[PDB]
Symmetry: C3
Subunit: 122 residues, 3 copies
């Protein structure tokens, strides 16, 4: 019994001068790789992430483009093989989510935790 | 955990909407969601935003599935306490939107799930 | 209620073995492999485990072998629908069996398979 996280971030096409969904995915992947490595150096907690392309739909009156905004969804699980303290991991995820929000220049960002039963095959 | 998230899975109906990419499929469903979400928001004052992911759904070829799977879209969203006073009314709104999305996409079936989640909202 | 379980599996696509060259092509690769192992299991036990599959990249430390910006992966998910499932525990055992078959067939060294509580509303 453990936790997974899910983060939803915009890609900020204009600030990063990207022009394809795959460039935005490679952008966020590289940014996560850098900040997860830094946090691992500090705390020995490495937060790996599975990143998926997406579009997020909300009201055009509140800033959404027609048909939605390009986004990345990042998800990962606390693996007991690597994580001894679920609370420290969860605090680490929250720090990383805030740092991703800052580096991606996002005005808002969601970070969820969901209970999950992990079967790890090695 | 302290709120709910939903997940809906829908086909993209290339036979009816005559689309031919992952982009035009996300654009189609996203534009449709944006319209039905706004319509429900006007009626109920509950706006349900959605995160839309490209996918394929794999099932038995003898039940209609193409080889390697049917093109689909996965829609997710979370009830944010800053926007949602009443989680049961939000749940009923999501279900109403799911049935409406099924109708607009001309889907024979459609799944809608609710999962408990703990939301941290940074603004 | 509709109280049930969903599974989530994360698999690499093993470009060194299958040599796919795009995300759409590795999605079709994993989709075909799942289709065939789900079919075999359905013929034997009458439990068909469908899967939604999503393209993705998985980010971990390059020190441990991750490519820059992430490794190409596929996420597979599915949910036990009480209209088809007679025994949720047998469904769960079947998912685990299929996940291990997928691991073997994709020649993955490691693979995660999660179960998450969910409430399914099924419209037909
Ligand atoms: N459901 C809502 N009800 C009422 N008001 C809303 C709602 N959504 C947005 N608003 C209003 O719109 C304005 C923007 O608010 P945001 O919170 O940034 O609005 C959100 C949500 O609508 C939606 N969204 C984000 N994460 C999720 C998720 N996990 N699931 C589903 N939808 C998601 O996408 C928007 C952010 S879009 C990506 C972030 C953006 N590039 C940035 O720089 O901030 C603000 O004025 C809000 O009051
Ligand atoms: N698991 C099963 N076991 C036994 N019989 C099944 C099963 N699935 C389908 N059938 C048979 O096929 C008939 C059609 O059933 P459907 O429910 O439409 O079968 C489903 C599921 O097999 C699969 N699927 C849908 N949602 C999900 C999800 N969230 N996770 C995993 N898989 C998903 O994909 C199919 C729908 S595919 C997209 C919808 C379709 N374009 C349409 O217009 O209806 C049904 O009446 C049964 O006879
Ligand atoms: N988080 C970590 N903390 C510490 N050490 C780690 C961590 N991850 C990997 N390592 C080290 O690297 C070695 C390999 O470990 P793996 O378990 O294979 O490392 C994992 C995880 O880091 C990550 N990953 C996989 N599934 C998930 C998921 N659901 N959510 C988030 N991330 C996921 O991706 C890697 C697998 S990449 C795909 C599988 C691979 N092609 C293969 O053939 O095995 C391991 O022995 C450790 O020494």
């Amino acid at each position: 019994k453990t936790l997974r996280f899910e983060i939803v971030s915009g890609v900020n096409k204009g600030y990063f001068h990207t022009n394809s969904q795959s460039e935005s995915l490679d952008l966020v992947g590289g940014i996560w790789q850098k900040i997860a490595k830094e946090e691992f150096e500090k705390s020995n907690i490495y937060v790996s992430a599975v990143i998926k392309p997406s579009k997020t739909v909300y009201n055009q009156e509140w800033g959404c483009p027609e048909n939605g905004e390009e986004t990345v969804v990042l998800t990962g699980v606390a693996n007991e093989e690597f994580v001894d303290d679920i609370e420290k991991w969860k605090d680490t995820v929250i720090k990383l989510a805030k740092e991703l929000k800052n580096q991606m220049k996002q005005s808002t960002l969601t970070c969820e935790f969901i209970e999950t039963e992990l079967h790890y095959f090695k």
